[PDB]
Structure 1
Amino acid sequence: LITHFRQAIEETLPWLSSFGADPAGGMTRLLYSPEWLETQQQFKKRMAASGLETRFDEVGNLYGRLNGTEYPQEVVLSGSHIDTVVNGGNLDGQFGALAAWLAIDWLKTQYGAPLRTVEVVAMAEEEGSRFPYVFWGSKNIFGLANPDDVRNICDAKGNSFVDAMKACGFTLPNAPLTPRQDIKAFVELHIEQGCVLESNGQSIGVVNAIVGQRRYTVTLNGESNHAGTTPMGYRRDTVYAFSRICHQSVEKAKRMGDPLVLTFGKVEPRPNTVNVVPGKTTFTIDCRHTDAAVLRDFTQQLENDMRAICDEMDIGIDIDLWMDEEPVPMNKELVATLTELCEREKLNYRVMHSGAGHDAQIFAPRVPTCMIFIPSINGISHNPAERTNITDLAEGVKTLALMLYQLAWQ
């Protein structure tokens, strides 16, 4: 079965990738761009000619529908986002949507009409790579997006949001949409964007949950001084202070173990010169975990450690916690069905978590949802060097087709 989809991929993937191709390398889609519009239009046509009822909702999300026989109003959905970042992609997002179409087209030819309605979706924007807003697609599906937060009061480097939208043929609503209550289940296939599958030698990941997140901005204020005339004992060096904090905290994170992660990726000393003790340093913090209580307890302890260190050195501290989102588990029953399914099939799988956010995180709190991971080479993502071995890709489409059978044909 793996070899069948293998071919389907070789004929469809290169075709889809042509639209939005960037000479500078990789993929460059971006919300409401001429390249965006052409992609959806081309994809909608292909689907319609396949025998599925196609449509665009109010903001550009694309659907492909196959009606069920006894519970036609209960729908099983599957898909991913159609947009990308500025350079390179080809697999992130669009593959999950391509897969759902391949799976559904195959299911219909082998078993005819399903008993429950099944649908494929190509969502508009999951990566705010053009405008200062994220999840414009999935959010409007559940009516969580407020038109005010994007009206004109906001735009990219020149063009207005409302203009680019109407330029593609869609009118910005006057109020939030009506939430969908007809969705019985949602399944999203994505590339992991990591190395865990490769390093443990596997091919399919059963996602149990989506990690919660916390992002800080911290500012330390000491005193700038002559690097040669000021003895060590008279100093209030902000870089040395940062160093004690980073070193100590990273170590602590390591002892706690997976799935905990801690990163200090942006640092800005002032004046930032070789012969001047820096009296100021601005830095960031990024911490994640699957358990809400652990996330809170660990980051709270760090706040106490930073405070203790700085009070000792007599350096002032300013802590700004600007991103605080909780963990998102996947439906308990759906995970069980998928797991026992992998067992039944001789699939080389692994139960794991997602260290990154996906459209799936907004569906989950409203309807039963789950995700399927496929490995990525060298954990590369968001750049042209993104790639996965085709036999792994086929294994993904195959496993997606099986879950959908169990949910709408069984």
Structure 2
Amino acid sequence: MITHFRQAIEETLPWLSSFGADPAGGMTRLLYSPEWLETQQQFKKRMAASGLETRFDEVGNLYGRLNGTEYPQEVVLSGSHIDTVVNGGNLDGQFGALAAWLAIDWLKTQYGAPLRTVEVVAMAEAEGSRFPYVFWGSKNIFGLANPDDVRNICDAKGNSFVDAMKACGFTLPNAPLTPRQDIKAFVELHIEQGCVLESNGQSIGVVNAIVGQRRYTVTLNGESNHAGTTPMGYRRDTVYAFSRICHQSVEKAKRMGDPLVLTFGKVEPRPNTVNVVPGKTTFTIDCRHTDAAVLRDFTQQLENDMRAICDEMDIGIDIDLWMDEEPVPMNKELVATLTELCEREKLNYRVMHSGAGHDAQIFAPRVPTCMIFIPSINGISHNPAERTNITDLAEGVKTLALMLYQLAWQK
């Protein structure tokens, strides 16, 4: 069975990874890009060929469905996001969608139709890496996505959300969607992304909680001027202002210690020229913690700090909080069932939280959910070198299969 999944992964992973392969390294498959569309089209086609009933929903989440014999109205769901960051790896997101499909297909062949319906899902986006919105895919599954929040947003190159979506053959809905009521449980297999499993020698992570997370886009407005003729004390330099903000804030975060993390990942000065004092800089903030209050208090302090610096420098600031998620626990009963499985199968597991966000955190408050981690070598992710031992991946798909067996082929 490990042998089967190994083979299946070796067969399909390289194939799936070709759609959105970036010449500059790794994967770049952003929400509603042509690469995004082609991935979902091809993936759909392969699931169909395997005998699954396939569909898009109104926003382009992809489903492969195998109907239940005794409770067709109850759905056990598994999968993950297909989107990536820029120059990402080929496991983050897509592996969990691929795995759910491989698990289901194998269960189908070994044990025939399930008692209750099982679905593979490949969700539209969870990376929040193209537009200033996150979890467009999963939020729509539960009608949590307000179309007003994306009707007026663009990517870095000025393409509107609405246009890109339409280019992929989807129409922005007029109002939030009807939330699904038929889901009994959701199970997301995913690479750990950090090195907790690898450094402690363990093979499977049983996730019991996911971190809280804020993302900001901040815009500094100063004055563009000549690099040579503008005396230093007359300047309104947005890159200098940005640097004080970044330097001071990272310093503060380092004093708070783990698990506070703080990242200034994207910086865009304008006009971005060697001999021009930059009169505008737009940058992002990503900040996370296991505790909601710590995350709130720390980030609010950061907002005050930024306003203080800017005010002192006579520079305009616009602070745009576009992701604000509470930490969420996984379902206790499902976490026990998973732990019990690991004990029974004699798996070398650990119980741990996720430092990454996942569609699972959107699911959790609405339907019973849990996550299975497998290791990430060197704790490298969002980097083309992201990789995992093939037997570890297979062990993950096996563990996923057994969980889905319990949940859908048993009453």
TM-score (norm 2): 0.79
Q: State which drifts further: 245-254 or 291-300.
A: 245-254
How far does residue 119 in structure 1 lie from its aligned partner after superposition? 0.3
How far does residue 283 in structure 1 lie from its aligned partner after superposition? 11
| Partner Cα distance (2:159, 2:222) in 1 | 42
Q: How many residues align?
A: 410
Report if the CA contact (8 A) 1:208-1:330 is conserved.
yes
Pair 1:342–1:226, CA change in 2 (3 A): same
**Residue by residue, what CA displacement relative to the aligned partner does 1:133-191 show, whole Å, maximum 9, x if unpaired?**
22111111111112222235545514332222222222221221111111110111111
Partner of 1:121 in structure 2? Answer: 121
Pair 1:125–1:303, CA change in 2 (3 A): closer
Pair 1:339–1:256, CA change in 2 (3 A): farther
Report if the CA contact (8 A) 1:334-1:370 is conserved.
yes
Pair 1:275–1:20, CA change in 2 (3 A): closer
| Partner Cα distance (1:137, 1:286) in 2 | 20
Pair 1:305–1:391, CA change in 2 (3 A): same
**Residue by residue, what CA displacement relative to the aligned partner does 1:88-141 show, whole Å, maximum 9, x if unpaired?**
321111110000000000001111111111000111121232223221111111
Partner of 1:102 in structure 2? Answer: 102
Partner of 2:301 in structure 1? Answer: 301
Partner of 1:209 in structure 2? Answer: 209
The structure number with the bigger radius of gyration is: 1
SS at match of 1:240: helix
Listed as ranges, the gaps of 5+ residues in structure 2 are: none
How far does residue 233 in structure 1 lie from its aligned partner after superposition? 20
How far does residue 294 in structure 1 lie from its aligned partner after superposition? 5.7
Report if the CA contact (8 A) 1:130-1:156 is conserved.
yes
Pair 1:350–1:220, CA change in 2 (3 A): same
Pair 1:116–1:259, CA change in 2 (3 A): same
Report if the CA contact (8 A) 1:203-1:374 is conserved.
yes
Pair 1:299–1:377, CA change in 2 (3 A): same
Partner of 2:176 in structure 1? Answer: 176
Pair 1:277–1:10, CA change in 2 (3 A): closer
Report if the CA contact (8 A) 1:139-1:362 is conserved.
yes
Report if the CA contact (8 A) 1:216-1:320 is conserved.
yes
How far does residue 289 in structure 1 lie from its aligned partner after superposition? 3.4
Pair 1:244–1:27, CA change in 2 (3 A): closer
Pair 1:210–1:231, CA change in 2 (3 A): same
How far does residue 281 in structure 1 lie from its aligned partner after superposition? 14
Q: State which drifts further: 79-88 or 304-313.
A: 304-313
How far does residue 237 in structure 1 lie from its aligned partner after superposition? 17
Over the aligned positions, Cα root-mean-square deviation in angstroms equals: 4.8
Pair 1:386–1:282, CA change in 2 (3 A): closer
Q: State which drifts further: 386-395 or 85-94.
A: 85-94
Pair 1:250–1:183, CA change in 2 (3 A): same
Pair 1:242–1:335, CA change in 2 (3 A): same
Q: Following superposition of structure 1 onto structure 2, how do residues 54-133 of structure 1 map, counting pairs within 5 Å?
A: 54-133=54-133
Q: State which drifts further: 365-374 or 279-288.
A: 279-288
Pair 1:168–1:218, CA change in 2 (3 A): closer
Q: State which drifts further: 217-226 or 93-102.
A: 217-226
Q: State which drifts further: 138-147 or 91-100.
A: 138-147
Report if the CA contact (8 A) 2:133-2:322 is conserved.
no
How far does residue 211 in structure 1 lie from its aligned partner after superposition? 1.3
SS at match of 1:105: helix
SS at match of 1:335: helix
Partner of 1:267 in structure 2? Answer: 267
Partner of 2:340 in structure 1? Answer: 340
| Partner Cα distance (2:241, 2:366) in 1 | 45
| Partner Cα distance (1:234, 1:268) in 2 | 22
Report if the CA contact (8 A) 1:132-1:156 is conserved.
no
| Partner Cα distance (1:381, 1:280) in 2 | 31
Q: State which drifts further: 304-313 or 37-46.
A: 304-313
**In the alignment, does 2:251 pair up with 1:251?**
yes
Report if the CA contact (8 A) 2:132-2:322 is conserved.
no
Pair 1:165–1:119, CA change in 2 (3 A): same
SS at match of 1:334: helix
How far does residue 347 in structure 1 lie from its aligned partner after superposition? 0.6
**Residue by residue, what CA displacement relative to the aligned partner does 1:282-302 show, whole Å, maximum 9, x if unpaired?**
999865433445656778999
Report if the CA contact (8 A) 2:131-2:153 is conserved.
no
How far does residue 405 in structure 1 lie from its aligned partner after superposition? 0.8
| Partner Cα distance (1:107, 1:99) in 2 | 12
Pair 1:147–1:379, CA change in 2 (3 A): same
How far does residue 361 in structure 1 lie from its aligned partner after superposition? 1.1
| Partner Cα distance (1:116, 1:269) in 2 | 54
Report if the CA contact (8 A) 2:100-2:120 is conserved.
yes
> Percent same amino acid among aligned pairs?
100
| Partner Cα distance (1:272, 1:23) in 2 | 25
Report if the CA contact (8 A) 1:215-1:321 is conserved.
yes
How far does residue 46 in structure 1 lie from its aligned partner after superposition? 1.1
Report if the CA contact (8 A) 1:29-1:35 is conserved.
yes
How far does residue 348 in structure 1 lie from its aligned partner after superposition? 0.9
| Partner Cα distance (2:383, 2:396) in 1 | 22
| Partner Cα distance (2:58, 2:124) in 1 | 11
How far does residue 372 in structure 1 lie from its aligned partner after superposition? 0.8
Q: State which drifts further: 290-299 or 103-112.
A: 290-299
| Partner Cα distance (1:159, 1:312) in 2 | 35
Report if the CA contact (8 A) 1:310-1:317 is conserved.
yes
How far does residue 57 in structure 1 lie from its aligned partner after superposition? 0.8
How far does residue 18 in structure 1 lie from its aligned partner after superposition? 1.6
How far does residue 227 in structure 1 lie from its aligned partner after superposition? 20
Report if the CA contact (8 A) 1:264-1:286 is conserved.
yes
| Partner Cα distance (1:158, 1:220) in 2 | 19
Report if the CA contact (8 A) 2:132-2:153 is conserved.
no
| Partner Cα distance (2:88, 2:172) in 1 | 29
| Partner Cα distance (2:386, 2:49) in 1 | 31
